[PDB]
Amino acid sequence: IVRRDEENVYYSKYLNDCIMEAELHEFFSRELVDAGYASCSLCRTIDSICVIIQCAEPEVVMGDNHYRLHKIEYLLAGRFMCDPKNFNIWVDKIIKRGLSAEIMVDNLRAKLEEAMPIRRAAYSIIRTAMRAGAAGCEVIVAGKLRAQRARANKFKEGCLISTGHPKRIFLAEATRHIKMRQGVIGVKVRIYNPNIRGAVMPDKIEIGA
Amino acid sequence: MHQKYTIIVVGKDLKLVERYVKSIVKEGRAFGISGPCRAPVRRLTITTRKSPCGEGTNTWHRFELRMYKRTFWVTCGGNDISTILSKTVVIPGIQVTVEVEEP
Amino acid sequence: MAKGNRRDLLERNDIEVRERDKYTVHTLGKKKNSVAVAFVKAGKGDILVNNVPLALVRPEILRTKVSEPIMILGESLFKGLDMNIKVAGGGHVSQIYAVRQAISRGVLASVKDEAARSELRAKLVSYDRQLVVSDPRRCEAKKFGGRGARARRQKSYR
Amino acid sequence: GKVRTKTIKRAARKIVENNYESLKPKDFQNNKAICSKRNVAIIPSKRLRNKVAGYVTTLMNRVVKGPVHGISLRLQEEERE
RNA sequence: ACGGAGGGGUACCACCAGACGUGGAGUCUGCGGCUCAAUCUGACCCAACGCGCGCACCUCACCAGGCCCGGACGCGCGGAGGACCGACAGCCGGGCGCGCUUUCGCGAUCGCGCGGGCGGUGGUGCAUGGCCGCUCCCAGCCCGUGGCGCGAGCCGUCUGCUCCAUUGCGACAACGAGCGAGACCCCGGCCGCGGGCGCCGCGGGACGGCCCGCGCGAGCGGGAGGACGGCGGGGCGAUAGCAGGUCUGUGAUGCCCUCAGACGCCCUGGGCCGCACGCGCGCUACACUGGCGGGGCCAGCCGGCGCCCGCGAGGACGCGCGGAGCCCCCGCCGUGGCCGGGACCGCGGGCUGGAACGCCCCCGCGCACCAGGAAUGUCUUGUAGGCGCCCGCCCCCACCGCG
């Protein structure tokens, strides 16, 4: 009673836009490093596009009189071929930066590029997380940390999950690559917030009096 | 007047699609009716080798992308050109849930 | 070709509407992907499967298998009533068993006296239990180590 | 199966001695309803609830047959003499 | 850590009982050797060998030959009284203003030297990141306070009873916590509510709960009633580690090598497929529990059709509509390497494509093969096995792979 060759337009008009989002994630990550970039989202309103950003300090990306933002809007439109002025943008601010892995790991990358030793950077990150109210943070720094023969030394503090579906909700992970004279220094972070949002971790029972 | 309009909404996650459904049903009870049709789930499947080089046990990934689709074509003549707008802006603006309107 | 769960089947729109309303009872059978829908009414003992009588079902050897409950319970009840089955789903034998299950369950629903219904249940289940209770087992999935659910690719050590 | 992990046992004991009045030694339904009640407990799942209820039933009929260690069930009244 | 030491447990990548196979032949494909101008390379017990997602061109690295600079940016010099860049005729040339005998053009978008770039399926995986594999189809791993030892270390973290499980009971110079295990997520089976172009959204239900035996206890055996009865199939996957694989997946990269007769990029051909030989995963058969001819009939991941030509494969037009093998019934053949089997070869008709060496159809010819030595693999309910059907890569093509 129905034709399957027509709804393929609706289905293929969702896929393309999901992909368009990922290129933006990559571009922002390569661009708004200094603005505490974290993530992105999109809303394909027919008249115009809207994009919502999550940044520690938006005023940096906002730019005096909204210049950087506007310079960006005209740019994306040419690439995705939309009429500019229909490619507007909005920015939102993260308040719990310690619960965000991306902010932490990027800060760590900065601190590392200034030559400070790993032992201080990691534990400063971890203190920052715990102050934010977290049940664990693990840091790892693999590579040619010494003369040769690269090794991984990992730092941790609290308790962490490692398996199960719950690791896709309460466990936030991220990684980066740091290019240096000796070579490449792999770094990755993971944080555990069990009381996140409103969801309740299973196998967790509370009783009454 | 009467324009036989139809509402189609698409999403990849099943929790907002059902939330959007409820809002619309709530906001379209007057401007005629708006009962839903739940379509068969289009599931996209991709199988990939878990290895970038082809070494060791031949082990496979199994991704998929479920896409859920609902269709309120119940407005019909019960909505005018402007009347469709009323509700469509009164419903929540969930970040991701494609919508298209056609007569 | 047919799919079993289709709305065009469960409601049996095949029958015309003025005739669709004379059928009081409704019934279900199944086995594997097969599903059968029966519409039982009042008549003088006639049965049909996909617009074909019961004597001329096709595997030939199983005709007894579908006629079982009649020669068990007796022909009195069935002679009293008239039925029109329709089935759709995988396999000849699956269809046979689904059909017999539907027969039995429907004739069970025709009687209103619960006591007789229980007595008939005991009379019938004793001979066999799959005449009332659906068989649950169903085809199981395969894995990537080989070309079967539990079999594996042959391994050469040297 | 027969996997009665620590959580089940500890929880069952805890909710038992505080609710001996609202439970029975063999029912699985009334015990289940009580555990579902919010004033006493919060079971994030369903299967957890059922398991906890079953262990409670076993624990309470064990009690009624005779006292069980680790349960302060107010029996001081019978033995305070 | 090991023991051809003892004592307790466990598992079809172990055995008992059995089933189906391989190693026997022909053939598809990959692997070493020979040959060649080249027959590009990684991987070698489990833990390399239809695996690094279908090689006529590209892909493409290798062989024989030729265009182009797409030399960023700085300093010195030169230049419109003309920097650099294109072309008819006629040859040489596979070909091209590539080169050549000549004379028309174009116009600073720069030329040369000195520094400095870009790029590179170029080397090192024994310099690295990341991702996988294996240890591991495992059940184990650790913190604070305290105690014993000069100390490396020990107790906690168990020489008892249970559990698939460091799963639990009950004790103890230990007390109290955490990760892993389970819990959790997807699928299926029964019932209810709602909605409904198309069967799809939210919930209930099963918990060692009832009875009987045992056992202090955790828990073991049997019988019920029930859609389902005692981890139903999958996903995730601890600490520590390997000189395991990948620099040939990448605007991931350290140090080397190449950089105007180029290892850059683009074109034309050839090759990766060549064949006295050894072996790895598969496919087809060795027949009567069968082969041929005619007819009847049902699936699921899901899914497109009419009319007219042509034996067929295919083709010209035009619209939106739609599902098979085994099996069952009737006949022929009649133990004959026969009508079993279908490799090889000789005429012919078409499709893809810029281009057949590629793939389909028709007539004729009609190879090995009689159930396979020493040796060896997999498997417990909708399972093995048998039967076919869809997607991936793809101009064409599936004996492969996921289902």
Short mmCIF file of N, CA, C and O (backbone and C1' of nucleotides) in Angstrom, two decimals, chain C residues 1-3 5-8 30-33 58 60 88-92 95 129 133 137-140 142-144 146-158, chain E residues 13 22 45-46 49 51 189-190 196-199 226-228 233-234 280-282 295-301 323 328-329 377-384 401-403:
data_model
loop_
_atom_site.label_atom_id
_atom_site.label_comp_id
_atom_site.label_asym_id
_atom_site.label_seq_id
_atom_site.Cartn_x
_atom_site.Cartn_y
_atom_site.Cartn_z
N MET C 1 5.70 -15.25 1.42
CA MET C 1 5.12 -13.93 1.04
C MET C 1 4.33 -13.30 2.18
O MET C 1 4.50 -12.12 2.48
N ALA C 2 3.47 -14.08 2.82
CA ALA C 2 2.66 -13.57 3.92
C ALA C 2 3.49 -13.48 5.18
O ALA C 2 4.55 -14.10 5.29
N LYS C 3 3.00 -12.72 6.16
CA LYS C 3 3.83 -12.27 7.26
C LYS C 3 3.23 -12.58 8.63
O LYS C 3 3.92 -12.41 9.64
N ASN C 5 1.66 -11.40 11.12
CA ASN C 5 1.25 -10.34 12.02
C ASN C 5 0.47 -9.24 11.32
O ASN C 5 0.05 -8.28 11.98
N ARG C 6 0.25 -9.35 10.01
CA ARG C 6 -0.40 -8.30 9.26
C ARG C 6 -1.82 -8.07 9.75
O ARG C 6 -2.56 -9.02 10.06
N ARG C 7 -2.21 -6.80 9.81
CA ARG C 7 -3.56 -6.45 10.24
C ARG C 7 -4.61 -7.02 9.30
O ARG C 7 -5.73 -7.31 9.73
N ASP C 8 -4.26 -7.20 8.04
CA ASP C 8 -5.20 -7.74 7.07
C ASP C 8 -5.55 -9.19 7.35
O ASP C 8 -6.47 -9.72 6.73
N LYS C 30 -0.21 -21.33 16.56
CA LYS C 30 1.09 -20.96 16.02
C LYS C 30 2.13 -22.02 16.30
O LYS C 30 1.98 -22.87 17.18
N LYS C 31 3.20 -21.93 15.52
CA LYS C 31 4.32 -22.85 15.55
C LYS C 31 5.36 -22.28 14.61
O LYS C 31 5.09 -22.13 13.42
N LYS C 32 6.53 -21.95 15.14
CA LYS C 32 7.56 -21.26 14.37
C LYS C 32 6.95 -19.95 13.87
O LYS C 32 6.22 -19.30 14.63
N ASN C 33 7.21 -19.53 12.64
CA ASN C 33 6.71 -18.27 12.12
C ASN C 33 5.28 -18.36 11.64
O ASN C 33 4.74 -17.37 11.15
N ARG C 58 -2.48 -30.80 1.77
CA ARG C 58 -1.61 -31.19 0.66
C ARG C 58 -0.52 -32.18 1.04
O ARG C 58 -0.21 -33.05 0.20
N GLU C 60 -0.71 -34.72 2.71
CA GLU C 60 -1.39 -35.98 2.46
C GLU C 60 -1.27 -36.95 3.62
O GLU C 60 -2.25 -37.58 4.03
N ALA C 88 -0.85 -18.47 7.66
CA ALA C 88 0.16 -17.80 6.87
C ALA C 88 1.46 -17.75 7.65
O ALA C 88 1.55 -17.08 8.67
N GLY C 89 2.47 -18.45 7.14
CA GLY C 89 3.79 -18.40 7.72
C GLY C 89 4.55 -19.64 7.35
O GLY C 89 4.05 -20.53 6.67
N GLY C 90 5.78 -19.70 7.85
CA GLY C 90 6.73 -20.64 7.30
C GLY C 90 6.28 -22.08 7.44
O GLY C 90 5.96 -22.55 8.53
N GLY C 91 6.28 -22.78 6.32
CA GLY C 91 6.38 -24.22 6.29
C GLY C 91 5.05 -24.93 6.22
O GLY C 91 4.05 -24.49 6.78
N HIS C 92 5.05 -26.07 5.54
CA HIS C 92 3.88 -26.91 5.44
C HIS C 92 3.51 -27.54 6.79
O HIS C 92 2.35 -27.48 7.22
N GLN C 95 2.40 -25.11 9.48
CA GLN C 95 1.03 -24.74 9.21
C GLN C 95 0.06 -25.81 9.68
O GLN C 95 -0.99 -25.50 10.25
N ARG C 129 -0.14 -32.49 24.54
CA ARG C 129 -0.17 -31.19 25.19
C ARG C 129 0.04 -30.04 24.23
O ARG C 129 -0.37 -28.91 24.53
N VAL C 133 -1.20 -25.90 24.17
CA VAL C 133 -0.10 -25.06 24.58
C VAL C 133 0.87 -24.93 23.42
O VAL C 133 1.31 -25.94 22.86
N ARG C 137 9.92 -23.11 21.27
CA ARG C 137 11.25 -23.02 20.69
C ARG C 137 11.20 -22.45 19.28
O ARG C 137 10.27 -22.69 18.51
N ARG C 138 12.23 -21.67 18.95
CA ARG C 138 12.26 -20.88 17.73
C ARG C 138 13.69 -20.77 17.24
O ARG C 138 14.64 -20.93 18.01
N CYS C 139 13.83 -20.47 15.95
CA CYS C 139 15.14 -20.47 15.32
C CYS C 139 16.07 -19.47 15.99
O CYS C 139 15.67 -18.35 16.33
N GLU C 140 17.32 -19.87 16.15
CA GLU C 140 18.30 -19.15 16.93
C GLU C 140 19.41 -18.60 16.03
O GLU C 140 19.67 -19.10 14.93
N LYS C 142 23.07 -16.88 14.54
CA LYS C 142 24.40 -17.37 14.24
C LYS C 142 25.47 -16.35 14.61
O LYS C 142 25.19 -15.18 14.84
N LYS C 143 26.71 -16.83 14.66
CA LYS C 143 27.85 -16.06 15.11
C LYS C 143 28.93 -16.06 14.03
O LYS C 143 28.89 -16.85 13.09
N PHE C 144 29.89 -15.16 14.19
CA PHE C 144 30.84 -14.85 13.13
C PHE C 144 32.06 -15.76 13.09
O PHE C 144 32.88 -15.62 12.19
N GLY C 146 31.98 -18.81 12.38
CA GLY C 146 31.70 -19.84 11.40
C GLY C 146 30.38 -19.65 10.70
O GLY C 146 29.83 -18.54 10.66
N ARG C 147 29.86 -20.74 10.16
CA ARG C 147 28.66 -20.75 9.33
C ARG C 147 27.52 -21.46 10.04
O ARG C 147 26.73 -22.19 9.43
N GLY C 148 27.42 -21.27 11.35
CA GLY C 148 26.34 -21.86 12.11
C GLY C 148 26.28 -21.26 13.49
O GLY C 148 27.20 -20.57 13.94
N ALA C 149 25.17 -21.53 14.17
CA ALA C 149 24.98 -21.04 15.52
C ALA C 149 26.01 -21.58 16.49
O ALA C 149 26.52 -20.82 17.32
N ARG C 150 26.32 -22.86 16.42
CA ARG C 150 27.23 -23.49 17.37
C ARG C 150 28.44 -24.13 16.71
O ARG C 150 29.44 -24.37 17.39
N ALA C 151 28.39 -24.43 15.41
CA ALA C 151 29.53 -24.96 14.70
C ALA C 151 30.55 -23.85 14.41
O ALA C 151 30.21 -22.67 14.32
N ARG C 152 31.80 -24.26 14.26
CA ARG C 152 32.91 -23.34 14.07
C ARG C 152 33.69 -23.70 12.82
O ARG C 152 33.58 -24.80 12.28
N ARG C 153 34.49 -22.74 12.37
CA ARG C 153 35.40 -22.98 11.25
C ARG C 153 36.50 -23.95 11.66
O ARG C 153 37.05 -23.86 12.76
N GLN C 154 36.82 -24.87 10.76
CA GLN C 154 37.84 -25.87 11.04
C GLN C 154 39.19 -25.20 11.22
O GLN C 154 39.56 -24.28 10.49
N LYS C 155 39.95 -25.69 12.20
CA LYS C 155 41.20 -25.07 12.63
C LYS C 155 42.36 -25.99 12.26
O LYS C 155 42.32 -27.19 12.53
N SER C 156 43.39 -25.41 11.66
CA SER C 156 44.59 -26.13 11.25
C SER C 156 45.76 -25.66 12.11
O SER C 156 46.19 -24.51 11.99
N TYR C 157 46.27 -26.54 12.96
CA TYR C 157 47.33 -26.15 13.88
C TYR C 157 48.66 -26.01 13.16
O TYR C 157 49.41 -25.07 13.41
N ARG C 158 48.97 -26.94 12.26
CA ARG C 158 50.20 -26.88 11.49
C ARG C 158 49.91 -26.77 10.00
O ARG C 158 49.06 -25.98 9.59
P C E 13 35.53 -27.17 24.64
"O5'" C E 13 36.85 -27.17 23.75
"C5'" C E 13 36.80 -27.54 22.39
"C4'" C E 13 37.88 -26.87 21.58
"C3'" C E 13 39.29 -27.00 22.11
"O3'" C E 13 39.90 -28.24 21.77
"C1'" C E 13 38.88 -24.75 21.57
P U E 22 34.49 -34.65 3.88
"O5'" U E 22 35.92 -34.16 4.41
"C5'" U E 22 36.28 -32.79 4.32
"C4'" U E 22 37.64 -32.53 4.93
"C3'" U E 22 38.83 -33.16 4.24
"O3'" U E 22 39.26 -32.43 3.10
"C1'" U E 22 39.00 -33.48 6.58
P C E 45 55.35 -19.78 14.23
"O5'" C E 45 54.00 -20.53 14.62
"C5'" C E 45 53.33 -21.35 13.68
"C4'" C E 45 52.31 -22.24 14.33
"C3'" C E 45 51.23 -21.53 15.14
"O3'" C E 45 50.19 -21.03 14.32
"C1'" C E 45 52.06 -23.41 16.34
P C E 46 49.19 -19.91 14.86
"O5'" C E 46 48.42 -20.61 16.06
"C5'" C E 46 47.36 -21.54 15.81
"C4'" C E 46 46.79 -22.08 17.10
"C3'" C E 46 46.18 -21.06 18.04
"O3'" C E 46 44.85 -20.73 17.70
"C1'" C E 46 47.63 -22.48 19.25
P C E 49 45.60 -16.73 9.12
"O5'" C E 49 46.04 -17.34 7.72
"C5'" C E 49 46.31 -16.50 6.62
"C4'" C E 49 46.71 -17.28 5.39
"C3'" C E 49 45.74 -18.36 4.94
"O3'" C E 49 44.66 -17.84 4.18
"C1'" C E 49 47.94 -19.21 4.94
P C E 51 38.37 -15.61 5.57
"O5'" C E 51 39.29 -14.44 6.14
"C5'" C E 51 40.70 -14.58 6.18
"C4'" C E 51 41.35 -13.33 6.70
"C3'" C E 51 41.02 -12.06 5.92
"O3'" C E 51 40.81 -10.97 6.80
"C1'" C E 51 43.36 -12.35 6.01
P G E 189 8.20 -12.80 20.22
"O5'" G E 189 7.68 -13.99 21.14
"C5'" G E 189 7.86 -15.34 20.74
"C4'" G E 189 7.85 -16.27 21.93
"C3'" G E 189 6.70 -16.08 22.90
"O3'" G E 189 5.52 -16.73 22.49
"C1'" G E 189 8.75 -16.24 24.09
P C E 190 4.15 -15.91 22.28
"O5'" C E 190 3.54 -15.81 23.75
"C5'" C E 190 2.89 -16.93 24.32
"C4'" C E 190 2.26 -16.60 25.66
"C3'" C E 190 1.33 -15.40 25.69
"O3'" C E 190 0.03 -15.69 25.21
"C1'" C E 190 2.81 -15.33 27.54
P G E 196 -6.02 6.21 16.63
"O5'" G E 196 -5.26 5.35 15.53
"C5'" G E 196 -4.02 5.78 15.01
"C4'" G E 196 -3.32 4.68 14.24
"C3'" G E 196 -4.13 4.01 13.15
"O3'" G E 196 -4.19 4.76 11.95
"C1'" G E 196 -3.08 2.37 14.45
P C E 197 -5.42 4.56 10.95
"O5'" C E 197 -4.77 3.84 9.69
"C5'" C E 197 -3.70 4.44 8.99
"C4'" C E 197 -3.36 3.68 7.73
"C3'" C E 197 -2.46 2.47 7.93
"O3'" C E 197 -2.90 1.38 7.13
"C1'" C E 197 -1.49 3.93 6.36
P G E 198 -2.82 -0.11 7.71
"O5'" G E 198 -1.26 -0.43 7.74
"C5'" G E 198 -0.60 -0.94 6.59
"C4'" G E 198 0.76 -1.48 6.92
"C3'" G E 198 0.94 -1.98 8.35
"O3'" G E 198 1.83 -3.10 8.37
"C1'" G E 198 2.51 -0.30 7.91
P C E 199 1.25 -4.58 8.57
"O5'" C E 199 1.00 -4.69 10.14
"C5'" C E 199 1.99 -5.24 11.00
"C4'" C E 199 2.55 -4.22 11.95
"C3'" C E 199 3.60 -4.73 12.92
"O3'" C E 199 4.59 -3.73 13.13
"C1'" C E 199 1.82 -3.79 14.12
P G E 226 -1.82 -25.33 35.09
"O5'" G E 226 -1.37 -23.82 35.27
"C5'" G E 226 -0.92 -23.06 34.16
"C4'" G E 226 0.36 -22.33 34.48
"C3'" G E 226 1.19 -21.91 33.29
"O3'" G E 226 0.70 -20.75 32.64
"C1'" G E 226 2.58 -22.92 34.90
P A E 227 0.07 -20.87 31.17
"O5'" A E 227 1.33 -20.80 30.21
"C5'" A E 227 1.35 -21.51 28.99
"C4'" A E 227 2.61 -21.22 28.22
"C3'" A E 227 3.91 -21.61 28.90
"O3'" A E 227 4.24 -22.96 28.68
"C1'" A E 227 4.07 -19.40 28.05
P C E 228 4.84 -23.85 29.87
"O5'" C E 228 6.33 -23.31 30.03
"C5'" C E 228 7.22 -23.30 28.93
"C4'" C E 228 8.38 -22.36 29.15
"C3'" C E 228 9.17 -22.57 30.42
"O3'" C E 228 10.14 -23.59 30.30
"C1'" C E 228 8.69 -20.26 30.14
P G E 233 22.30 -19.55 26.73
"O5'" G E 233 22.04 -18.72 25.40
"C5'" G E 233 22.05 -19.36 24.13
"C4'" G E 233 22.01 -18.35 23.01
"C3'" G E 233 23.15 -17.34 22.99
"O3'" G E 233 24.32 -17.84 22.38
"C1'" G E 233 21.09 -16.21 22.74
P G E 234 25.72 -17.07 22.55
"O5'" G E 234 25.41 -15.60 22.03
"C5'" G E 234 26.40 -14.59 22.03
"C4'" G E 234 25.85 -13.28 21.55
"C3'" G E 234 26.58 -12.03 22.03
"O3'" G E 234 27.72 -11.73 21.25
"C1'" G E 234 24.26 -11.76 22.37
P G E 280 47.78 -29.49 4.67
"O5'" G E 280 47.13 -28.04 4.74
"C5'" G E 280 47.33 -27.22 5.88
"C4'" G E 280 46.44 -26.00 5.86
"C3'" G E 280 44.99 -26.20 5.45
"O3'" G E 280 44.18 -26.76 6.47
"C1'" G E 280 45.85 -24.30 4.36
P C E 281 42.78 -27.44 6.08
"O5'" C E 281 41.82 -26.21 5.80
"C5'" C E 281 41.55 -25.26 6.82
"C4'" C E 281 40.70 -24.12 6.33
"C3'" C E 281 39.34 -24.49 5.75
"O3'" C E 281 38.36 -24.74 6.74
"C1'" C E 281 40.41 -22.92 4.34
P G E 282 36.99 -25.48 6.35
"O5'" G E 282 36.54 -24.77 4.99
"C5'" G E 282 35.58 -25.37 4.14
"C4'" G E 282 35.31 -24.51 2.93
"C3'" G E 282 34.41 -25.11 1.87
"O3'" G E 282 33.03 -24.98 2.19
"C1'" G E 282 36.32 -24.16 0.85
P G E 295 4.78 -28.00 -16.01
"O5'" G E 295 3.80 -28.38 -14.81
"C5'" G E 295 2.43 -28.62 -15.07
"C4'" G E 295 1.72 -29.27 -13.90
"C3'" G E 295 1.63 -28.49 -12.60
"O3'" G E 295 0.69 -27.44 -12.60
"C1'" G E 295 2.22 -30.70 -12.12
P G E 296 0.84 -26.26 -11.52
"O5'" G E 296 0.58 -26.97 -10.13
"C5'" G E 296 -0.66 -27.58 -9.87
"C4'" G E 296 -0.81 -28.01 -8.44
"C3'" G E 296 -0.52 -26.93 -7.41
"O3'" G E 296 -1.64 -26.10 -7.17
"C1'" G E 296 0.68 -28.87 -6.85
P C E 297 -1.45 -24.75 -6.34
"O5'" C E 297 -1.17 -25.28 -4.87
"C5'" C E 297 -0.78 -24.38 -3.86
"C4'" C E 297 0.21 -25.00 -2.92
"C3'" C E 297 1.13 -24.04 -2.21
"O3'" C E 297 0.52 -23.42 -1.10
"C1'" C E 297 2.37 -25.89 -3.02
P C E 298 -0.19 -21.99 -1.26
"O5'" C E 298 0.25 -21.23 0.06
"C5'" C E 298 1.60 -20.83 0.22
"C4'" C E 298 2.25 -21.50 1.39
"C3'" C E 298 3.36 -20.71 2.06
"O3'" C E 298 2.85 -19.76 2.98
"C1'" C E 298 4.08 -22.93 1.70
P A E 299 3.47 -18.29 3.03
"O5'" A E 299 4.89 -18.50 3.70
"C5'" A E 299 5.79 -17.42 3.86
"C4'" A E 299 6.98 -17.82 4.68
"C3'" A E 299 7.83 -16.69 5.23
"O3'" A E 299 7.30 -16.17 6.43
"C1'" A E 299 9.21 -18.40 4.31
P G E 300 7.14 -14.59 6.62
"O5'" G E 300 8.58 -14.10 7.08
"C5'" G E 300 9.12 -14.50 8.33
"C4'" G E 300 10.61 -14.31 8.34
"C3'" G E 300 11.11 -12.96 7.89
"O3'" G E 300 11.07 -11.98 8.91
"C1'" G E 300 12.32 -14.63 6.77
P C E 301 11.14 -10.42 8.52
"O5'" C E 301 12.69 -10.18 8.21
"C5'" C E 301 13.63 -10.21 9.26
"C4'" C E 301 15.05 -10.00 8.79
"C3'" C E 301 15.33 -8.74 8.01
"O3'" C E 301 15.39 -7.58 8.82
"C1'" C E 301 16.49 -10.57 7.05
P G E 323 5.10 -11.27 -6.81
"O5'" G E 323 6.23 -11.91 -5.90
"C5'" G E 323 6.02 -13.16 -5.25
"C4'" G E 323 7.32 -13.78 -4.80
"C3'" G E 323 7.18 -15.11 -4.06
"O3'" G E 323 8.26 -15.97 -4.41
"C1'" G E 323 8.34 -13.56 -2.71
P C E 328 8.88 -36.50 -0.13
"O5'" C E 328 7.47 -35.92 -0.59
"C5'" C E 328 6.39 -35.85 0.33
"C4'" C E 328 5.09 -35.48 -0.33
"C3'" C E 328 4.68 -36.32 -1.53
"O3'" C E 328 4.06 -37.53 -1.16
"C1'" C E 328 4.41 -34.04 -2.04
P C E 329 4.05 -38.76 -2.18
"O5'" C E 329 3.24 -38.22 -3.44
"C5'" C E 329 1.83 -38.07 -3.39
"C4'" C E 329 1.22 -37.79 -4.74
"C3'" C E 329 1.62 -38.71 -5.87
"O3'" C E 329 0.92 -39.94 -5.87
"C1'" C E 329 1.72 -36.48 -6.62
P G E 377 42.92 -32.60 16.45
"O5'" G E 377 41.72 -31.88 15.68
"C5'" G E 377 41.90 -30.62 15.07
"C4'" G E 377 40.65 -30.14 14.38
"C3'" G E 377 39.44 -29.92 15.26
"O3'" G E 377 39.46 -28.67 15.92
"C1'" G E 377 38.81 -31.12 13.32
P U E 378 38.60 -28.44 17.26
"O5'" U E 378 37.09 -28.55 16.78
"C5'" U E 378 36.49 -27.50 16.05
"C4'" U E 378 35.05 -27.79 15.70
"C3'" U E 378 34.12 -28.08 16.87
"O3'" U E 378 33.68 -26.92 17.55
"C1'" U E 378 33.75 -29.66 15.15
P C E 379 33.15 -27.04 19.06
"O5'" C E 379 31.80 -27.89 18.94
"C5'" C E 379 30.63 -27.31 18.39
"C4'" C E 379 29.51 -28.32 18.23
"C3'" C E 379 28.92 -28.88 19.51
"O3'" C E 379 27.99 -28.00 20.13
"C1'" C E 379 29.27 -30.63 17.95
P U E 380 27.77 -28.03 21.72
"O5'" U E 380 26.49 -28.95 21.92
"C5'" U E 380 25.38 -28.84 21.03
"C4'" U E 380 24.14 -29.52 21.55
"C3'" U E 380 23.56 -28.97 22.85
"O3'" U E 380 22.14 -28.99 22.79
"C1'" U E 380 23.97 -31.27 23.07
P U E 381 21.27 -28.08 23.79
"O5'" U E 381 19.92 -27.82 22.99
"C5'" U E 381 19.91 -26.99 21.83
"C4'" U E 381 18.51 -26.71 21.34
"C3'" U E 381 17.42 -26.75 22.41
"O3'" U E 381 16.37 -25.84 22.07
"C1'" U E 381 16.98 -28.41 20.80
P G E 382 16.64 -24.25 22.04
"O5'" G E 382 16.69 -23.90 20.49
"C5'" G E 382 15.59 -24.21 19.64
"C4'" G E 382 15.98 -25.11 18.50
"C3'" G E 382 16.32 -24.41 17.19
"O3'" G E 382 17.39 -25.09 16.55
"C1'" G E 382 14.62 -25.98 16.83
P U E 383 18.36 -24.32 15.53
"O5'" U E 383 19.79 -24.95 15.81
"C5'" U E 383 20.57 -24.52 16.90
"C4'" U E 383 21.47 -25.61 17.43
"C3'" U E 383 22.18 -26.45 16.38
"O3'" U E 383 23.36 -25.83 15.89
"C1'" U E 383 21.22 -27.86 18.02
P A E 384 23.66 -25.81 14.32
"O5'" A E 384 24.17 -27.28 14.01
"C5'" A E 384 25.35 -27.78 14.61
"C4'" A E 384 25.57 -29.23 14.27
"C3'" A E 384 25.61 -29.55 12.79
"O3'" A E 384 26.89 -29.35 12.22
"C1'" A E 384 24.21 -31.09 13.93
P G E 401 33.40 -18.28 4.15
"O5'" G E 401 33.14 -16.76 4.51
"C5'" G E 401 34.18 -15.95 5.03
"C4'" G E 401 33.71 -14.56 5.34
"C3'" G E 401 32.46 -14.46 6.19
"O3'" G E 401 32.73 -14.60 7.57
"C1'" G E 401 32.26 -13.02 4.33
P C E 402 31.54 -15.01 8.58
"O5'" C E 402 30.56 -13.76 8.55
"C5'" C E 402 30.94 -12.54 9.15
"C4'" C E 402 29.82 -11.53 9.14
"C3'" C E 402 28.51 -12.00 9.74
"O3'" C E 402 28.48 -11.94 11.14
"C1'" C E 402 28.11 -10.86 7.70
P G E 403 27.37 -12.78 11.92
"O5'" G E 403 26.00 -12.21 11.35
"C5'" G E 403 24.80 -12.96 11.42
"C4'" G E 403 23.76 -12.42 10.48
"C3'" G E 403 22.47 -13.21 10.38
"O3'" G E 403 21.59 -12.98 11.47
"C1'" G E 403 23.19 -12.61 8.22
#
